[PDB]
Structures are given as C-alpha cells and as structure tokens.
Symmetry: C5
C-alpha cells in the first residue's frame, strides 16, 4: 500500500543521480545489449544509416536496495531515470541525437538491480555503398561510456537479439555480430571499454 | 474559488506522482480507448504509417479523492498531468515520439477517477504495401505498460470507435479491430498486458 | 518601478495558476476571436491547411486586481503567461502543435482584466480539394476548452476582421464566418461551447 | 573571481526580471539595430523570406548598478538573459519562431547598462515577386514591443550596418533603410513605437 | 561512491555556474581544438556547409579543486555541464543551432582542471562553389567567446587532429589549418580572441 510511497521517500534520501554508484574500488558492472528492430533508411550520398533499436542496460546500484520485510509486497519499483544514476553510454559514430521512443523509466528490485530498456531511433555514419550488392553494407554501431573508464564502469555484453527485426522491411538483415573491446587512449591514464554491434544488410532484390 | 485553491493544496500534500496508486493486493484498472482520426500519410518505401488518433485513458487514483461536503461546489478539477501519476503506456511499434496536440490536462472527480484524453500524431512501423489494393493495408497499433505488469496495472479495452474518422481523407477506413493480450516475456514471471488496434485501409478510387 | 515591484509581491501571494478563477456559481467568461494573417500552404494529398493567425483572448481574473491608489501610476502590467491561469483552449482539428510567434506575455489591468494576444502558426485537417475552383475550399477552425464546460468557462466571441489578411498571398478569401455554438458530448452532463472560424478561399488566377 | 561572485548574490536580491525598470515619468530607453548577415532563401510561392541577422539591443536597468569601489576589478559581468528583464521585442510579420544562434548572455556594466547582441535566423512574410527583376524585391522587417507603449519603453534606432552581409550569397543586397515610427491603436490611449528595416535585394545574374 | 557523494556536496556550495572562475587579475585560459569527423552536405545554392565535428575544450576552475587525501580514490569526477561554468564560445558564421550529439558531461580532476569534449553537428555559411574543382572549396569555422574579452577569457589552440575524418565520404579532405586572432570591435577597449579553423575539400570522383 503506502509502503511504496514510504520507500520512494527513503530511496531519494541522500541520493545523487550524477554520481556513479561505485562501491569501494569495485567498478559498477553494466550489462549491455542491442536488438535491431528496423533499418528505416540509407543515404548513399551522405553515408548515413537510420535505425530503430531497443537497448538493454542493466547494472546494480547498491544505494537503491531495501529490506523487503520493511516494505511488505514491494519487490520492485518503477522510477524515472532523471531521479537515478544511469550509464552515460554514447554511440561513438552517431550523426544525430538519439530519439528515445519509450517512457524514460527504469525498473529496480529490492537488491538494487536496475533495468533501463529504451527503444531508440538514431542515425549513424556508415559506408552504405554496398547496400546494393550480394555482400551488402556493413555498419558498426559503436557504444561506450563518454566519461567513465573501465575501473569505474565495467561495460560487458549480453547476447544480442535479431528475433525482433521486422520482416516486411525493404532491407534484408544478413547478420549481426557484437564484440567488446578495450583500449588505452592518448589522453587518459585509465583504459576505456566499448561494445560494437556490426550489422550487415542489403536491399531485397 | 477558495475551495478549489484549498483542494489543490491538499491533493499535492504527501503526493508522489512517481508512485502507481495501487492499493493492497489490487491492481490499478486503466480503461483504454483509441479513436482513429486521420491517416496523414503512408511511406511505402520505409513501411511507415502516419496517424492522428484520440486516446482515452481513465483510472482511479485513490490518493486523489476528497469529501465533497468539505469542498462544497467542487465536483471535479482540471489538473496538469505532470502533477499526477499517469499510466506509462508505450506504443510498441512506434518509430517516432508522440506529438501531443491538445492541452496536457486531466479531469479528476471527487472519488479520484482520472480521465486523460490526449489527441496525438504519431508514426508507426507498418507493412503498407497493400494500400492500393481492394483488401487494403493492415497496420497494428500496439500499446502497453512499459514497466508495470498485470498484477499492478490492469489494461482494459473500451469499445472500438471509428466515428471520428474524417470523411475526406484519400484513405478509406475499411475496419478497425482490437484485442487484449496478456503476454509473458523470457525475463519475468508476471505477464504484461497489451492492447492492439488493427486498422485496415486502402487508397480511395 | 518600485510600485510595480511591490505589486508583483502582493499578487503572487497564494496565486495558483492551475486553478480556474471562478467565483461561486459564476463561470469565468472568456472572450475569443481569430484573425487570419496568412494561408501558408495547402496539402492537397494529405488534406491539410497551414495557417498563420492572431488570437485575441481576454477574461477577468479576480485574484489579479488592485487599488490603483495603492500603486500610483500602475494601470496595467506585463505578465508571463506561465505565471497565470490561462484558458485551456484547444484547436479541435489541428494536426500539429501550435507554434507561438510572439512573446508569451499577457496584459493585466487593475480590475483583473487579462488580455493575451498571441500570433500563432498551426496546421489543420481540412478538405482543400476545391482550392482551385471558383467556389474554393472551406476550412473550419474549431476552438473550445479541453476540460472546462459551460458553467465554468463561458466562451464568447468578439467580432471578426479580415483586414490583417496579407494581400500579396496566392490565396484569395471568398468567405469568412465565426459563430459560437454550444453542444453536448457523449461524456458529460454539461454542454461545452466552441467558436468556429470558417474560411473559404481559393487560388488566384 | 571572489568579488564577481559577491556581486551576483547582491544583484539577485530583490531583483525581478518580470518588471520593466521604468521610473516615474521615465520610460526605459531601448536602443535597437539590425545587421543583415545573409538571405538564406526566398519562397516565391508562399511569399516568405528566410534571413540570418544580428540584433543589437541596449538599455539601462538601474537595479543592476553597483559601486566598482565595493567590487574592485569588476567593471562588467556576463549574465544569462533569463536572469534579467529584457525588452519584449516582437517581429510583427514573422511566420516562424526566431532561432537564436548565439549564447543567450547579456553584458552588464556597473552603471546598469545592458547589452544583448543575439544572432538570429527567422522567416518573414514578404512579397518576393520582384526578386528576379532589376527593381528587386522589397521586404520589411518590423520590430516593436509587444506589450509596452512609448511611455514605458522608448524604442530608438541606432545607426545600422551591412558591412557584415556575406559577399558570396546568390542574392545581391541592394539597399537597406530604417525608420522609427510611433503609431496608435483603437485599443490604447498610448502609442506603440516600432523600428522597421526595409531591405531590397535581387537574384544575381 | 560515498566519498564522491560527499565531494559533490562540497563543490556545489557557493558555486555559481554563471561566474567565470577568474583569480585576481588572472584570466581563465581555455584550450580549444576542433576535429573534423564528417562533411555531411554542401548547399551550392544557399552557400551552406553541414558538418559533424569533435570539440576539445579545457580550462582550470580553481573553485573545483580538492585534496585527494581528503577524498581517497577520487581522482576525477564526471559532472553535468549545466552544473558548472563553461566558456560561452560562439560559432560566428553558423546558420543553425548546434546539435550536441554526446552526453553533456564534463570531466574534472582534483586540481580543478575541466575537460569538455562534445561531438556536434552544425551548419555554417560558406562559399562552397569551389567544391567541384581541383582547388576545391574553402570554409572557415570561426569560434570565440561571445561575452568575455582577452583579459577575462584567454582562448588558446591545441593541434587540430584530422585523424578522425571518415574515409568513405564523397568529399576529400585537402587541408585543415587553425589560427588565433584578436579583433577590436567599435565598442570596447579590450580585444576579443577568436580561433578559426579553415578546411579545404573537394568532391571525389
Ligand atoms: C467518478 O467517476 C467514476 C467513473 O465514472 C464514477 O464511477 C462509477 O461509479 C458508478 C456508480 O457508483 C459505478 O457503478 C457500479 O458498480 C457496480 C458495477 O461494477 C454495480 O453494482 C453498480 O450498480 C449499482 O447497482 C444498482 C442496481 O442496478 C444500480 O442501479 C445503482 O446505480 C448502483 O450504483 C454500479 O453500476 C461504476 O462502476 C463506476 N465506474 C468506475 C470505472 O469505477 C464515480 O462514481 C465518480 N465519482 C463521483 C463522486 O461522482
Ligand atoms: C534482482 O534482480 C537481479 C538481476 O536480475 C536478480 O538476479 C539474478 O538471478 C538469477 C536467478 O537466480 C541468477 O542466476 C543471477 O545470478 C542474478 N543476476 C545478477 C546480476 O545478480 C535477483 O534475483 C533480484 N533480486 C531479488 C531481491 O529478487
Ligand atoms: C556603461 O555603458 C554605457 C554604454 O556604453 C556607457 O555610456 C556611454 O559612455 C560613453 C563614454 O564613456 C559615452 O560617450 C556614451 O554616450 C555613453 N553611451 C550611452 C548609451 O549612454 C557608460 O559610460 C558605461 N558605464 C560605465 C560605468 O563606464
Ligand atoms: C589535471 O589535469 C591537467 C590537464 O591534464 C593536468 O595538467 C598537466 O600535467 C601534464 C604533466 O603532468 C602536462 O603535460 C600538462 O601540460 C599539464 N597541464 C597544465 C600545464 O595545466 C594536471 O596534472 C591534472 N591534475 C592532477 C591532480 O592530476
Ligand atoms: C480593465 O480592462 C477592462 C477591459 O478593457 C475594462 O472593462 C470593462 O469596462 C469597459 C467599459 O467601461 C468595457 O469596454 C469592457 O468590455 C468591460 N469588460 C468587462 C469584462 O467588464 C476595465 O474598465 C478596466 N479596468 C480599469 C480599472 O481600467
Ligand atoms: C571521449 N573519448 C575519451 C576521452 C578523450 O578522448 C579525452 C579525454 C581527456 C582529454 C582529451 C581527450 C573517453 C572515452 C570515449 C572517447 C571517444 C573518442 O575520443 C571519440 C571522440 C569523438 C568522436 C567519437 C569518439
Ligand atoms: C520491455 N518489455 C517488458 C520488459 C522486458 O522485456 C524485460 C524485462 C527485464 C529484463 C529483460 C527484458 C515489459 C513490457 C514491454 C516489453 C517490450 C518488448 O521487450 C519490446 C521491446 C522493444 C520493441 C518491442 C517490444
Ligand atoms: C475533449 N472533449 C470534451 C471532454 C470529453 O470528451 C470527456 C470528458 C470527460 C470524460 C470523457 C471525455 C470537452 C470538449 C472537447 C471535447 C473534444 C472532442 O471530443 C474531440 C475529441 C478528439 C478530437 C477532437 C475533438
Ligand atoms: C499587440 N499590438 C498592440 C496591442 C493591441 O493591438 C491590442 C491591445 C489590446 C486589445 C486589442 C489589441 C501592442 C503593440 C503591438 C501590436 C501588434 C499588432 O496588433 C499585430 C498583431 C498581429 C500581427 C501583427 C501585428
Ligand atoms: C559581439 N561582438 C563583440 C561586441 C560588439 O561587437 C559590440 C559590443 C557593444 C556594442 C556594440 C558592439 C564581442 C565579441 C563578439 C563580437 C561578434 C560580432 O559583433 C559578430 C556579430 C554577429 C555576427 C558575427 C560577428
Ligand atoms: C508589476 C508586475 C510585473 C510583472 C508581473 C507581475 N505579476 C505576476 O507575475 N504574477 C504572477 C502570479 C500572479 C501575479 C507584476
């Protein structure tokens, strides 16, 4: 009943959504996956692919946990993302702002596990010259934290999902591979991880 | 009137718009209706339909009720939605953010029944290839709660309504059907209800 | 000025811009009129009219009144509309959000009379098929409150004027009318008024 | 700096950016000019001209004054326009919202003099029929206060400039004149001044 | 973590994001670099270039420093830019607002050194008529403080890296240069410094 009201109150107490919830030396592990829903368009002149996808981002926030016996019935809560820390993931080769298609809410259970599952439309730089060939065009969707390094934010992949690709598109989805990389940059002391989704596709016919 | 001014004070006191107003072992029943108003356009290359529709959502928020004898004359109030909990219904196959055309206000009576009735323009993914044939094209417009499952938010369909369809469109509205599904996901033990409106349309002539 | 600064400080006390300023039984009377400045475009395929127009809206807000001899020289003040109650008028057949072209300020005098005079661009659903005939096409621009009925918000017209219509347009005005009606809807026990501006126009040539 | 910081806390005190800083029998004088940077497009069908320009606006706000002696080093401060009163200048014949291209900051010196110099892109209603003729097309960009009459806000022209018109435009800028006018209305005892910029241009050929 | 949360509380105190962090007579030195990623389009009719680029900006804010011994583990934090001072760099000849592609977060180390690295899409006025020639077209990208002169904000370049220019563009990069300038405007006594990036490029094939 009102326990949920009571819980939101305590959870917001002394919480800062700008601050990554690392706990003494241990990085926040962030599990990450992309599912391709639709390739909306290609621009062969300007080298751009327009896509709709669903992101899966999940991690543990130790500040957002609670004893279930103090709030009977409350096993999970639905929370607007502006009120909690969320990973600052960025598409490295995007040429447009992401358009979030779904309500900006995350699910949080009693042990502090968070799930933010946004569906998103965004345009990306890509060489789409081969879209008209048997081998198709290959586009890399590269994602990573904009400002958090490996030892703060440990980005890891879950298995991706093409089962949600719409069948009636004018683009045939040949394949989708994903890989986690990590590199030191000529800029910073700590290394940064990234996850890249490579999608190959062609125009039917 | 003073009584409204006083009533607004009390309704915001101890009120959290992020908390679904469930009440002990009972979900919030959300009644849901869609009236198709106009099919704005069809993108036959990218498989997209652009529609304008009127949504009708209503539910009882038990934290928003008041004794009429205490606030005499005040039988209902008009409140901005940003100050109210609202169902987090997502348009599952939307490829654009919804453009809300009407004022973002809801009606609330003294037993906490809320009505929110936005008019919306939105683009959806759809196989429109059959639009210039007699059988026409069929688009599904699928909605459901993004983060609340069946035991928290009970989505209930109301009557199919095509009376608002403008008569001078270049698209003949053949039929609109609806179905309420309660589907499980490979993730959660609890199902998530969704309401699907199926509209069949074809180019006049 | 000092007196204007002192007046704001008084007027803002307890002011709630979400609460309609009715006074026991008495509705708030709202005067409304529209002047067409320009027909920007007609979309013959999708049945849409793009127009620029000037609304005149005025009403009395009784919490916004003051003794002029307590604030000598202060006869009217300029107030951002975000700070005051404004009628929740909607364009019933708009297919886009209204784009406001002018500063969002209302004039308020010492007897509580408020004037808000925005210039607005907005697109409407309209059968424009006969735009190239001598009879021309007719568009109805219908306006009314979205959540207030007759006994709370009494919409009235002030008379029209077409003298602001730009004369170098490619469209010629053939007829203009604006009437106030009062109709019932399936929802409510109470009637809701509206003002409708009916413009007939055609391509010159 | 340390004193700049302290000057802000003082200036914010009792300051109301909604109240025009008039005195008894002393309008706020607003100096105003326009520099045309480029004519982006002309729309001969819909009668629209698209322009990028630089406005200069300066006025004195006696509530922003300070003693340099009390704040040594601080001759001027850089302030967000949202923090202070600014003239509600409207473009009378604009068919679009002004796109502000520059940081929304004003310069304020110790005597209270505020300078605001935004770069703007905006579209205006205009008869561009003559754009291909030798006579050229003539457009009038008319600006004035939306809600303040002469006795509150005294609009004045400053000597304009076209040294900043880009020389590789496809449009040849022929001539630009300016004039301050003061006109009455049937509504108001007091007149409302405006500054109008007349520009004559033609396609280069 | 808990140290970091404590750290945020402290930096936020008395901190005014509107006040440039000058220290007695010392300007804030701001290092500035542009990395061209993609030329998206050219408009040979409207003389416009559309570009995606990566800006590197860095400066020290002495109000943002702490002792790592007081806050063990915390070497650097990531902070929303809206919550701290940032240079008011303007794109002088831009004809559109900047679309910021990346999270609006800056990095700050314990000595108060701030790094802000937004990726940005923006359109610029430019004579692109050389694009189809051996010499190609030359476009200038002129940036500088809008409201701070040389003695307040000291704009310095860093090397303009073009290792990020995508290879599959239809435009070939011929050369990029960078120059600092100081200009005196008929207004003030101090100079305003601008950094200009000059890019030469031509259509491939
Ligand atoms: C605020 O708005 C809400 C939503 O419209 C109002 O809610 C409705 O109240 C109805 C009347 O109280 C209520 O009706 C029924 O409850 C049962 C149906 O599930 C049914 O048993 C009742 O029948 C009653 O039985 C007799 C015998 O026939 C009837 O003749 C009497 O009318 C009895 O009331 C009612 O039909 C309905 O369920 C409810 N709707 C929702 C969605 O909750 C609410 O009253 C408004 N508040 C106020 C104070 O006006
Ligand atoms: C809260 O959510 C987490 C994350 O889903 C739940 O954890 C998983 O449970 C499965 C099934 O036993 C385990 O195999 C995994 O090891 C868990 N994942 C992680 C990341 O820890 C967890 O069960 C939930 N906690 C509560 C209190 O119910
Ligand atoms: C603040 O700025 C105003 C505007 O520039 C200054 O007023 C000018 O002063 C100069 C001489 O210093 C005169 O020649 C101009 O006629 C003035 N202009 C206007 C519009 O009045 C003013 O001096 C500045 N204040 C301080 C403290 O220097
Ligand atoms: C905070 O960041 C700045 C910027 O990287 C660091 O400053 C530099 O130190 C290196 C060598 O130690 C020099 O090559 C740079 O020229 C320095 N930048 C200058 C001159 O400001 C600074 O050391 C960092 N602080 C901490 C605590 O690590
Ligand atoms: C404030 O403005 C209102 C409207 O102009 C003034 O109005 C009322 O009186 C006028 C004639 O005396 C009428 O022309 C108005 O239509 C009428 N309006 C209403 C709704 O009552 C009013 O006098 C002004 N108040 C003061 C003190 O000047
Ligand atoms: C942002 N950058 C690292 C930070 C950094 O380089 C940097 C840090 C500090 C100073 C100078 C540069 C952090 C991890 C992401 C990486 C991204 C890549 O650079 C990049 C830049 C522009 C477009 C696409 C990709
Ligand atoms: C978001 N998802 C359910 C939650 C969930 O799946 C989920 C929860 C937790 C972990 C992993 C997945 C809640 C109800 C909606 C459903 C939506 C569907 O996925 C989906 C995603 C993208 C496009 C179309 C459909
Ligand atoms: C919004 N509606 C009335 C309110 C109401 O219906 C309503 C009220 C309470 C409960 C359920 C519905 C108020 C007056 C306007 C009317 C609008 C028209 O239907 C309409 C709907 C959709 C597009 C165009 C026009
Ligand atoms: C806003 N109006 C004056 C006020 C006023 O008229 C008015 C005031 C009160 C009642 C009725 C009308 C103030 C000075 C500007 C002027 C603008 C012009 O109307 C106008 C309207 C629409 C498009 C272009 C121009
Ligand atoms: C704004 N201006 C300087 C100040 C100033 O000129 C000025 C100040 C006060 C009064 C009159 C003029 C400050 C530094 C930037 C410079 C910009 C340039 O004008 C400009 C304006 C519009 C487009 C391109 C360039
Ligand atoms: C003198 C003056 C200038 C500008 C505004 C006002 N009043 C207000 O902004 N209010 C907000 C709510 C009621 C009053 C006064």
């Amino acid at each position: 009943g009102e326990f949920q009201r009571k819980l939101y109150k305590e959870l917001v107490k002394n919480y800062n959504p700008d601050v990554i919830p690392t706990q003494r030396d241990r990085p926040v592990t962030v599990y990450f996956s992309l599912s391709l829903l639709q390739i909306m368009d290609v621009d062969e002149k300007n080298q751009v692919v327009d896509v709709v996808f669903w992101l899966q981002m999940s991690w543990t926030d130790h500040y957002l946990q609670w004893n279930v016996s103090e709030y009977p019935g409350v096993k999970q809560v639905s929370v607007p993302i502006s009120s909690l820390w969320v990973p600052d993931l960025a598409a490295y080769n995007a040429i447009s702002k992401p358009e979030v298609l779904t309500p900006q809410l995350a699910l949080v259970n009693s042990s502090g596990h968070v799930q933010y599952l946004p569906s998103i439309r965004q345009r990306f730089s890509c060489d789409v010259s081969g879209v008209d060939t048997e081998s198709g065009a290959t586009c890399k969707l590269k994602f990573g934290s904009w400002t958090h390094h490996s030892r703060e934010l440990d980005l890891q992949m879950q298995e991706a999902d093409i089962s949600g690709y719409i069948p009636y598109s004018r683009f045939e989805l040949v394949g989708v591979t994903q890989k986690r990389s990590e590199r030191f940059y000529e800029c910073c002391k700590e290394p940064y991880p990234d996850v890249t989704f490579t999608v190959t596709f062609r125009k039917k016919g």
